[PDB]
Amino acid sequence: GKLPPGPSPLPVLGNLLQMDRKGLLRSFLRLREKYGDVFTVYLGSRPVVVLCGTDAIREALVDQAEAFSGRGKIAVVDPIFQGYGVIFANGERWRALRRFSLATMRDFGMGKRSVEERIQEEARCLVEELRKSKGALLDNTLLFHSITSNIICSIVFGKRFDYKDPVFLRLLDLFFQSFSLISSFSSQVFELFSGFLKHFPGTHRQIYRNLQEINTFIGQSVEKHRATLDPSNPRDFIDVYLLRMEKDKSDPSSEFHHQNLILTVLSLFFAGTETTSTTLRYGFLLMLKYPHVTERVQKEIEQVIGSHRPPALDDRAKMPYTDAVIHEIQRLGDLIPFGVPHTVTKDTQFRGYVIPKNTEVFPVLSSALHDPRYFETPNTFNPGHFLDANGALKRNEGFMPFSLGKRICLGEGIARTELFLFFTTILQNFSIASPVPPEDIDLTPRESGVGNVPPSYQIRFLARH
Ligand code: HEM
Q1: Contact residues for 122 (Cβ-Cβ < 8 A; gap 6+)
Q2: Closest ligand 1 atom, CA of 408?
Q3: Based on the number of CB atoms within 10 Å of its own CB, is 263 exposed (0-12), middle (13-18) or buried (19 or more)?
Q4: Protein residue with its CA nearest to atom 11 in ligand 1
Q5: 409 in ligand 1 pocket by Cβ < 6 Å?
Q6: Alpha carbons 176 and 169: distance in angstroms, whole number
Q7: Whose CA is nearest to atom 10 of ligand 1?
Q8: Handedness of CA 401, 405, 411, 414 (dihedral sign)
Q9: Cα angle value 411/413/416 (rounded, 5°)
Q10: N or C: which end of the chain has fewer CB within 10 A?
Q11: Atom of ligand 1 at shortest distance to CA of 404?
Q12: Continuous H helices in 227-290
C-alpha cells in the first residue's frame, strides 16, 4: 500500500527544511487543508503519520486500538544515526526494569479515597498559604507547581512535604533546571543568560548537586520504607515497588533497581506536575477574564458545598456547572496539542493507506479539542460547550485532553480530582482580582506565537467570609 499523502520530502532530511516561522500548529493546519485529516511528514528519513480531527483520531486510537497502541519512539529525531543504535539503558535488563515500573504504576493501588484525602489536605495547606498573602498581587506559578508536585510526593513517599522543606525545594529547583517550570518570559531569560547556560560554566554542576540530594533522600526513604513494610497495607508507590522486588527475588542491594526506582520517581514527578499545574494557572487566568463565570461557580459551591466544610470529590456529580467550567479550561488549555506519539504495532491499513509497523503516529489532540464538528465555537471560552439546556453536564466526543484508547493518561483520575478540588477549595475561600480589566486580558499562548506557555500574570486572592 501507500503511506498517507503529504508534502514531498527532501532525501534524508524529509520536511525539516520546509517548516514555517508561522508555527508548527498553524502549519499542520495548512497541511491538513491541503492533504486532508491524515497526512505524512518526514522527520529526516523517517515518515510520521499525523491524525487530525476527532473522527480520524478515534478511528485510529479506538477503532483500531491495539494496532495504534505502540509507545512513541523519540529515537526517530535523534541525530546520531552514524551509528544508529540508541544507547538504550544497559541492555535487556533495562527493558526489564522499565516494564517493572510500568507494571508497578499500573499495579499501584488507587486508594481513590486516600488520594482524595491527600488532595484535600494539600488544598487546605494551599488555602492557609493564600490567606497569608493578604490579597497581595502575586505570580501563582510556583505555588501551583508546589501543590501538584506535593501530591506526587505524598503518593510516592506517603506524606507531603512542607512547602519550604529543603528537599522539596531541591525538587522544585530541578523542575526549573529541566524547563518544567517555565513562564512567558522564561525564553527571553534563557536567551539573556545563554552564554552562561550553554557556553560556560553551564548548569550541569548545579543540576548534579540537586540530583545528589534528591538521590540521597530517596535512598533513605527506601530504607525507612523497607524497615516498616507491611504487605497487607502498601502505603505509597515505594511500598508497591518494594513489594514487587521482594516477589521478584530481587537483590535488596541492587544498584539497577535503585537507579530504576529513582528514574521512575522522577518520571512521576515530571508527569504529575507540569500539565496539571499549567492547567490550574490557565484556569485562573480564564477565571479573571470571565468574572461572571467565576461568580456562578462560587454560587454553585455555596449551594452544594456551603462554606463550613471542604469540597469533596463526591460533590462534583452535584456541580455540573463547575464541572463544565473545568472541562472547558482543559479544552481551551490544550496542554498537549500534538498528543504523545504512538507507533503502530504492525502494518496497519487506514483510510486505504498502509502505515508500516513501528511508524510514528501523532494523534493531534488540539485538532479534536478545537473540532468545530463537535464544539460550536472552538476558539471561544464557553462552559456551555459541556452543558445541555437542562444545565446538566454534556459528554463530548471531541473532549480528549488525556488522549484515548489503550494508553489514556494513567494520571487522568488524579489530575481531574486535583483540578476539581483545587479550583473549588480556592474559590470557596477566596475571590480573585487583577490589575487588568477582563476585556483586556489576553489568553493567547505566548512564546513565539508558538509554542506553549500561558501569559504570566498577577493575581490577588481576597479572603472570603
Ligand atoms: C491536566 C493534566 C494532564 C494531562 C492533560 C495529561 C495528558 C496525558 C496525555 C495526552 C498522555 C498520553 C497518552 C497517550 O500515549 O496517548 C498522558 C500520559 C501519561 N500521563 Fe498524563 N496528563 C496529565 C496529568 C497526569 C498526572 C497528574 C500524572 C500522574 C503521575 C500523569 C501521568 C501520565 C502517565 C504515567 C502517562 C503515560 C501513560 C502510558 O503510556 O501508559 N498525567 N497524559
Answers
A1: 147, 150, 151, 154, 160, 422
A2: 13
A3: middle
A4: 409
A5: yes
A6: 11
A7: 402
A8: positive
A9: 105
A10: C
A11: 16
A12: 237-248, 255-289
CB of 415 within 6 A of ligand 1: the answer is yes
Atom of ligand 1 at shortest range from CA of 148? 27
Residue pair 346/357 in contact (Cβ under 8 Å)? The answer is yes
Q: Are 438 and 294 in contact (CB under 8 A)?
A: no
Instruction: Tell whether ligand 1 has an atom less than 6 A from the beta carbon of residue 271.
Output: yes
End-to-end CA distance of the chain: 67
Q: Whose CA is nearest to atom 7 of ligand 1?
A: 402
Residue 97 to residues 74, 157, 226, 236, Cα–Cα distance (Å): 19, 20, 19, 19
If you write DSSP's letter for every residue of 304-367 in order, what string do you get?
A: HT-SSS---GGGGGG-HHHHHHHHHHHHHH-SSTT---EE-SS-EEETTEEE-TT-EEEE-THH
Q: Whose CA is closest to atom 19 on ligand 1?
A: 409
Residue 71's H or E segment, with its range, is strand 70-71
Choose which residue among 267, 409, 410, 418 to substitute to test ligand 1 binding: the one with the highest number of ligand atoms within 8 A of its C-beta: 409
* Determination approach: X-ray
Cα distance between residue 96 and residue 364, in whole Å = 30
What element of type H or E holds 431? strand 430-433
Cell numbers given for 79: 541525530
Decide whether any atom of ligand 1 lies within 6 Å of the 272 Cβ: yes
Grid cell, residue 244, equals 514487587
Bond into 451 cis (ω within 30)? yes
Phi and psi at residue 461, to the nearest 5° = -105, 110
- Closest C-alpha among 260, 215, 216 to residue 241: 260
Cell digits of residue 387: 452543558
Tally of CB atoms within 10 A around 83:
7
Q: Which domains does the chain have, with CATH numbers?
A: 1-465 (1.10.630.10)
Q: How far is the CA of 409 from the centre of ligand 1 (A)?
A: 3
Cβ of residue 279 lying under 6 Å from some atom of ligand 1: yes
**Whole-angstrom distance, CA of residue 42 vs CA of residue 49:** 9
- Whether residue 335 has its Cβ less than 6 Å from ligand 1: yes
Q: Does residue 40 contact residue 360 with C-beta atoms inside 8 Å? A: no
Binding positions for heme are 409
Q: How far apart are alpha carbons 391 and 324 in whole angstroms? A: 10
